[PDB]
Scaffold this active site. Structure first.
Site, PDB file in Angstrom:
ATOM      1  N   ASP A 120      -7.892  -6.016  -6.702  1.00  0.00           N
ATOM      2  CA  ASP A 120      -7.769  -4.992  -5.626  1.00  0.00           C
ATOM      3  C   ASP A 120      -8.811  -3.889  -5.848  1.00  0.00           C
ATOM      4  O   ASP A 120      -8.811  -3.281  -6.939  1.00  0.00           O
ATOM      5  CB  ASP A 120      -6.349  -4.421  -5.580  1.00  0.00           C
ATOM      6  N   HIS A 156      -6.905  -6.357  -2.131  1.00  0.00           N
ATOM      7  CA  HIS A 156      -5.767  -5.666  -1.469  1.00  0.00           C
ATOM      8  C   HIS A 156      -5.029  -6.655  -0.560  1.00  0.00           C
ATOM      9  O   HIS A 156      -3.843  -6.938  -0.838  1.00  0.00           O
ATOM     10  CB  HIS A 156      -6.241  -4.414  -0.714  1.00  0.00           C
ATOM     11  N   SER A 201       0.871  -1.199   0.000  1.00  0.00           N
ATOM     12  CA  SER A 201       0.000   0.000   0.000  1.00  0.00           C
ATOM     13  C   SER A 201       0.904   1.245   0.000  1.00  0.00           C
ATOM     14  O   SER A 201       1.620   1.433  -1.000  1.00  0.00           O
ATOM     15  CB  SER A 201      -0.966  -0.073   1.158  1.00  0.00           C
TER      16      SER A 201
HETATM   17  C1  LIG Z   1      -2.424   1.761   2.014  1.00  0.00           C
HETATM   18  O1  LIG Z   1      -1.560   2.110   2.795  1.00  0.00           O
HETATM   19  C2  LIG Z   1      -3.816   2.345   2.122  1.00  0.00           C
HETATM   20  C3  LIG Z   1      -4.805   1.567   1.253  1.00  0.00           C
HETATM   21  C4  LIG Z   1      -5.116   0.168   1.743  1.00  0.00           C
HETATM   22  C5  LIG Z   1      -3.706   3.799   1.660  1.00  0.00           C
HETATM   23  C6  LIG Z   1      -2.969   3.985   0.342  1.00  0.00           C
HETATM   24  C7  LIG Z   1      -4.260   2.347   3.580  1.00  0.00           C
HETATM   25  O2  LIG Z   1      -3.531   1.825   4.401  1.00  0.00           O
HETATM   26  N1  LIG Z   1      -5.428   2.941   3.902  1.00  0.00           N
HETATM   27  C8  LIG Z   1      -5.943   3.071   5.172  1.00  0.00           C
HETATM   28  C9  LIG Z   1      -7.224   3.625   5.275  1.00  0.00           C
HETATM   29  C10 LIG Z   1      -7.849   3.775   6.512  1.00  0.00           C
HETATM   30  C11 LIG Z   1      -7.202   3.373   7.677  1.00  0.00           C
HETATM   31  C12 LIG Z   1      -5.932   2.810   7.602  1.00  0.00           C
HETATM   32  C13 LIG Z   1      -5.232   2.392   8.880  1.00  0.00           C
HETATM   33  N2  LIG Z   1      -5.492   0.996   9.290  1.00  0.00           N
HETATM   34  C14 LIG Z   1      -4.680   0.070   8.469  1.00  0.00           C
HETATM   35  C15 LIG Z   1      -4.740  -1.357   9.009  1.00  0.00           C
HETATM   36  N3  LIG Z   1      -4.252  -1.383  10.398  1.00  0.00           N
HETATM   37  C16 LIG Z   1      -4.175  -2.769  10.899  1.00  0.00           C
HETATM   38  C17 LIG Z   1      -5.161  -0.570  11.224  1.00  0.00           C
HETATM   39  C18 LIG Z   1      -5.167   0.878  10.733  1.00  0.00           C
HETATM   40  C19 LIG Z   1      -5.303   2.668   6.361  1.00  0.00           C
END
Ligand SMILES: *C(=O)C(CC)(CC)C(=O)Nc1cccc(CN2CCN(C)CC2)c1
Ligand SMILES: *C(=O)C(CC)(CC)C(=O)Nc1cccc(CN2CCN(C)CC2)c1
Ligand SMILES: [Cl-]
Ligand SMILES: [Cl-]
Lengths: 850, 850
Positions: A786, A818, A708
């Protein structure tokens, strides 16, 4: 220093090695007790004070279901009480099976009913003892802890029968009448009576037969961005109190979000049924384009004295949502005041720099009428005094981080509302604030005919007491919340006061806020639930050495001072598995960054560390917002393969760069408009600190790998610092910020027009020419299906790499979204990752290859 | 023998080497003179007998346009006459330009009008001298060689004006009236008068605004399978003669195919506009599923004496297509008899084992009527004698190979039709047959009310003279056809009589067929056009050493014997470029296969061949049907990179295995129902012949590479014979035969139900477990937007490779279909291919890597 070269295993040998080290790790994929509830026995003769209910997974390859445990009135403090898990529910045994079958056609069928019939959450009605929960397709109910008393044996779950052809989602008990439940079916709100069996569709917004190009409307369901970017899934809320009618019946109310995705861009993601060679149509608000058209609606449900539906009146807002809630793009959160007099909502502007808390009277809602004659009558029949009440409004030059903290006190005075709420906006750290707001009659008169001024609904702030303060944040996301003791006038909360590497439970007065008292033992990070009665709390706690553990703690005071709060270990719920064999924990380190911040990191020393030898270095990275990788938690389950790398003879590094979570809004806002431009500096700075401190780190052979935002920074690293990073393995990377969604991108980078250069420099796809002209340095991994980071990010990036004449390596997972689910894909990924690092970084073949 | 290791160039070094060797090869991408036509001057005083018109590309980065050359009455046989190319057309200069512009905004604009304004084909009307041709968007006409005479300067093309909003496709002159043209616009047939400017839509079958899911109907256009698998693009045919009305006007007729693709499976191919993240809906008849619903229609066009449209009557078949043409799936070919009395068609059954030639009277067509009352009147008003006439019917246990040979003689007797037609069905080799068929009144009476028996329309065969015979085939595909001299009663034809490695022009009587006379010089392969007057022929000829050349030859007889035909070199049209520098031609070899056939092959010896050293071997392969790679043609343009491989120190091998073209139906039918199961045996057998004969072939390091069927066999090779093949580079491979289309798959493999095991064993995707467990052996290349072999073939194959835990390497070309067009993609492919062979076969690093 002579360079260490990793053992060069064959593909088949690595496959076996990874399978061998995975074999004793089956118990790990099993959820720890969660969704705790404390019900008092009220049994003077009996040995127990409370029964606790909770969801848990009894072991590996087992169903997440409801258990209960007995909390004694006293404990033998010589011994350690280990609470037994009593199953609340009987074995479901999927009904409508019939057939004939046999032992050979039934013992194989029981394997298929593991992942299906599992409970994700449950509702409870204290007054009746009614449990409501979805388990697979069915919606079921049992009773325990109410007037009927406490079972000593598993209860049979009672299927709520239906005529609905499709899967019912998001079941909720009506707090005012636990005979009535609501649920979503094909994007419309239904209600069902678990006693009378009466079933009634409330909303006629969606037709399942119609195309999604034509039929873009839904009710009671959060759209893509709200689920994925604002952690909100439910789109409807029961009024917690019923209104008694003159007939001797009652009116039940449901506030709900109605979404129109008509003007939202349609994208095509490949259909999982790859043989069809088809794509699913999907409403994805890409940054810069239209979000859904959102409004509030209320379903008014008239029930007679016998519990039968008289009528159902669907009601809309007296004026358009856009007029009443000027400049609001997102409904982040919604609910009701405890008395159900007002509906509340936390509303956001597009830039996500202005948060509003708004009380919405049911009186604002009028019946839906096509006839403009009858409709104009209804508008005029509502007073001008009835108006939206903005009880709170904050701003920030960084961004609003939405959380789940918002406690509304019982309404004592008529024209005042008293509440606790968390905010980063004042001090740049999330702190609890007790606020009192005056419910003024608005200067705006609807009869006049004009539209309202920006701040005609704003309520004056009579009082705003800071309950917490300092260089540390209160936690209000992903399970973290507060428990308010309205009796002793305390608030229990999680925070980072003692360390940003440890979550801890604190208590403090909200009347005369003074000294903040830590209730959890240092040397662990804690996830905590506090009993509704505020005389107990449970802690799910771990540290770097010790796997997760769940213990119960009793709260009390010294005789002489009820203000002073102490804890005593009562019993263990889930016993820690203890130090895991063939896992060496990493060392947490820190360094004073030339940025003026302390940056934390984890270091995995190569196993069997040889003297006077430098080792190849894999930097594991995420580095995006809303995530902290480095803290005093057990990493031997989630990040077990960082240990496997170490065992093969790799230095493994992890660094929480600027932008990371749990360090305050300023540390987070470091990369606002500048994503990609600061993260790798912090990673190199930390990587160069370790290299000067430890001689076994070979900077000639540094690899970088992430998913990500991690995959994004992995590409940025090879692009910006090819002098540092030999190889980059990018998983599901964001390559082009204009392709990603509104809620996330605009929050951190703003609108594309007001950040042309930030978007360009932040997008790796637009800088393909800057990638290395050497092969065996760049590797792209992406799930083909994804839904979050579309494969397009990869395919566009590849398109520009081909134009620029640059080499690349590529792995696709054709049946993965994803997060990789199907074990075979995860095994293949792990196998290819090690083999790639071995062949292109670790081994001596890798050194000869340059 | 010590193994030779290729020089290990960097990626940047290889990029430069490939660019250096490509620089002097710009003239090669330039079409040779084609679509020849001979018009007689008839100028006793003048020095020229004929003017020849033709399409050609004057040089590199230039427009395919119409040229003419002058054929003298006499030649100076001391010298070599090189005909000058006179441009027939003036510079188009795209009209509606206006603006202001400058030299800097016009000299850059002229670069954009190269690929756009190019002529692919043209129509001509002998009687009027009218040329019709599409050039970019416009449809234009000029006149030359008719009553108006012969221009000495370029003519200005006259735009046919239109009200049609979209691109007009497939323009055709009406042979009966060259003021009238027809064309396709948004899948409907239009007509336009180039004098009166009258424009009229004939068919109302398609609505451009409607969705393709709803609107699946088209007229005058061949559907996907007919274009891609039967080499037919046009779906409408002008009647060549007009019917004079009592009014002093005339009736013009257009026979056309009307297709309904409603029941044809819809697949989604990724949209070229990758930013949209959308997919285009496409009608792809996958093997085993429904082909389009096809029928014949006729447009009856009443014109008055002044040339204005009176009325247009659309007509359908008196009975359904399925009833009249029992068991017919495909309309392979259609047209008119020279008098236009009958429409003809070559019809195919689903299995493609039964071909029928059917005469269709215009009388079979009645006006389209919704009113069943008026419709039943029209049916009864047509006689029972009027019936479809099957003038020919053949079968085969292998398959019908559709060709373009079918000459219908002037109808002398009323109840007889006389024609030449080619067939493999009798002797298993394609030979010319003169057939006379009796047009019997059918035993079937339509008035009776019953449906017709399978063979009630079959015409008795009065006569079937074999014109050619032997262990060699007549050529009737991809430009190869016959010219019938109806005066001297001869037929000119191309064939393989002298060698299957050389195409040659032959002449023979069709009245008393005897000795077959070769007209083309041995030591070359020939593509030939014969003047309509049969006193000249042009040859496009090459051999392994000499690039393509175009020469004109005059035909005559000895004074004493007009039967004996001789040729004399008259003039050169296109002079050969001569032996190309830094290109070594390959050696054609052969070996007696244990299969009882001679198999031919090409061998590229490594350049600067060192003594007592064995070299790494790349086997280039296609190996599928309808293609011969090995013949006496120049390969230094199309297969120039097989030479580049040789120059880097690779043995390069090519072998036409069983199934290949130009060897007869039995040699071709070798793999019927058994695709994948016999091809690699023949490749290994030939590879092992070369290894015993030549000591410089290192069998330890054999690579295999191909596209389409070549990529398929490249995977089959690594799967079946991993002991022989170290590496396999598979381009756009078929991995799963149930995914490929009806026309191709069912022809060679039959219906999936009647060949379960053939389909399974023939599909590489179903045998993933049989691939090597070593990496750096398998490489998949695929264009992401491929319409023929969908990316799904790759994505499914990868899906099963991940399940089987097998490694793979992958390159995608995101903006490419089947054939790579955009130069950057071709450069990247060539670069990656050499680098991969270098790193995983050629170099010593490759040897160390195992
Ligand atoms: C990737 O990093 C992404 C898409 C999957 C952004 C590009 C992302 O992480 N998005 C994201 C959106 C909302 C909350 C969070 C945080 N979350 C991630 C998983 N962990 C275990 C808890 C917090 C990330
Ligand atoms: C691949 O080999 C493919 C698909 C592109 C079949 C799997 C194929 O080659 N199809 C095909 C269909 C019709 C005719 C031909 C033969 N044609 C190929 C190109 N050459 C230059 C002329 C003959 C192939
Ligand atoms: Cl209070
Ligand atoms: Cl004749």
């Amino acid at each position: 220093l002579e360079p260490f070269y990793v053992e060069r295993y064959s593909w088949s040998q690595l496959k076996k090695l990874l399978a061998d080290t995975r074999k004793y790790h089956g118990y790990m994929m099993a959820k720890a007790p969660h969704d705790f509830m404390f019900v008092k026995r009220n049994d003077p003769d009996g040995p127990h004070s409370d029964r606790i209910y909770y969801l848990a997974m009894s072991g590996e390859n087992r169903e997440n279901t409801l258990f209960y445990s007995e909390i004694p009135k006293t404990i033998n403090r010589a011994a350690v009480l280990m609470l037994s898990w009593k199953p609340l529910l009987d074995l479901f045994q999927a009904t409508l099976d019939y057939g004939m079958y046999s032992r050979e056609e039934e013992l194989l069928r029981e394997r298929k009913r593991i992942g299906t019939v599992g409970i994700a959450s449950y509702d409870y009605h204290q007054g009746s003892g009614t449990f409501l929960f979805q388990a697979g397709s069915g919606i079921y109910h049992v009773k325990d802890g109410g007037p009927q008393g406490f079972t000593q044996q598993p209860l049979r779950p009672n299927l709520v029968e239906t005529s609905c052809p499709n899967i019912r989602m998001d079941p909720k008990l009506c707090p005012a009448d636990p005979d009535w439940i609501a649920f979503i079916h094909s994007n419309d709100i239904w209600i069902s009576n678990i006693v009378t069996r009466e079933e009634r569709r409330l909303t006629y917004v969606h037709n399942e037969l119609a195309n999604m190009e034509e039929d873009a409307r839904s009710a009671g369901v959060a759209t893509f961005v709200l689920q994925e970017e604002f952690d909100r899934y439910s789109g409807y809320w029961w009024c917690p109190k019923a209104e008694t009618t003159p007939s001797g019946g009652k009116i039940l109310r449901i506030l709900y979000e109605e979404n129109d995705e008509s003007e939202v861009e349609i994208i095509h993601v490949t259909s999982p049924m790859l043989e069809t060679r088809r794509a699913d149509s999907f409403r994805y608000p890409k940054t810069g384009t239209a979000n859904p058209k959102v409004t509030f609606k209320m379903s008014e449900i008239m029930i007679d004295a016998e519990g039968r539906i008289i009528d159902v009146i669907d009601k809309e807002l007296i004026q358009p949502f856009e007029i009443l809630f000027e400049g609001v793009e997102y409904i982040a959160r919604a609910g009701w005041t405890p008395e159900g007099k007002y509906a509340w909502s936390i509303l956001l502007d597009r830039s996500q720099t202005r948060l509003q808390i708004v009380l919405i009277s049911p009186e604002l809602f009028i019946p839906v009428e096509d006839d403009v004659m009858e409709r104009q009558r209804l508008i005029e029949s509502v007073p001008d005094s009835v108006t939206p009440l903005i009880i709170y409004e904050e701003t920030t030059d960084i961004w609003i981080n939405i959380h789940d903290i918002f406690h509304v006190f019982p309404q004592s005075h008529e024209e005042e509302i008293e509440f606790i709420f968390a905010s980063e906006c004042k001090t740049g750290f999330r702190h609890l604030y007790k606020i009192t707001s005056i419910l003024k009659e608005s200067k705006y008169k609807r009869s006049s005919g004009g539209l309202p001024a920006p701040s005609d609904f704003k309520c004056p702030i009579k009082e705003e007491i800071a309950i917490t303060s300092g260089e540390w944040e209160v936690l209000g996301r992903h399970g973290s919340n507060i428990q308010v003791d309205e009796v002793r006038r305390l608030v229990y909360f999680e925070g980072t006061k003692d360390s940003p590497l440890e979550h801890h439970l604190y208590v403090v007065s909200y009347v005369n806020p003074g000294e903040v008292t830590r209730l959890t033992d240092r040397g662990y990070s804690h996830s905590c639930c506090i009993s509704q009665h505020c005389d107990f709390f449970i802690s799910k706690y771990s540290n770097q050495k010790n796997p997760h553990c769940v213990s119960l703690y009793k709260l009390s005071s010294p005789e002489d001072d009820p203000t002073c709060k102490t804890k005593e270990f009562w019993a263990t719920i889930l016993d820690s598995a203890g130090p895991l064999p063939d896992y060496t924990p990493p060392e947490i380190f820190s360094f004073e960054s030339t940025t003026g911040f302390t940056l934390y990191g984890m270091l995995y020393k190569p196993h069997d560390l040889q003297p006077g030898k430098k080792y190849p270095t894999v930097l594991f990275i995420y580095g995006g917002p809303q995530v902290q990788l480095v803290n005093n938690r057990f990493k031997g389950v989630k990040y077990f393969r960082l240990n496997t790398l170490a065992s093969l003879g790799y230095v493994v590094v992890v660094i929480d760069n600027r932008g990371s979570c749990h360090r305050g809004l300023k540390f987070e806002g470091a990369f606002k408009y500048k994503m990609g431009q600061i993260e790798i500096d912090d990673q190199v700075e930390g990587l160069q600190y370790l290299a000067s401190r430890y001689d076994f780190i070979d900077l000639d052979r540094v690899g970088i790998h992430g998913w990500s935002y991690g995959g994004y920074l992995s590409l940025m690293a090879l692009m910006q610092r090819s002098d540092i990073f030999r190889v980059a393995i990018a998983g599901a990377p964001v390559t082009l910020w204009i392709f990603y969604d509104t809620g996330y991108t605009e929050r951190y980078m703003g609108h594309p027009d007001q950040n042309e250069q930030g978007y360009y420099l932040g997008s790796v796809a637009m800088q393909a020419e800057k990638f290395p002209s050497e092969p065996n340095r760049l590797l792209l991994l992406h799930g083909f299906l994804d839904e979050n980071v579309h494969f397009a990010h990869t395919s566009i990036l590849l398109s520009f790499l081909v134009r620029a004449g640059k080499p690349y390596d590529l792995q696709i997972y054709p049946q993965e979204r994803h997060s990789i689910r199907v074990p075979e894909s995860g095994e293949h990924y792990e196998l290819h990752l090690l083999h790639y690092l071995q062949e292109n970084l670790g081994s001596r073949i890798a050194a000869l290859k340059v």
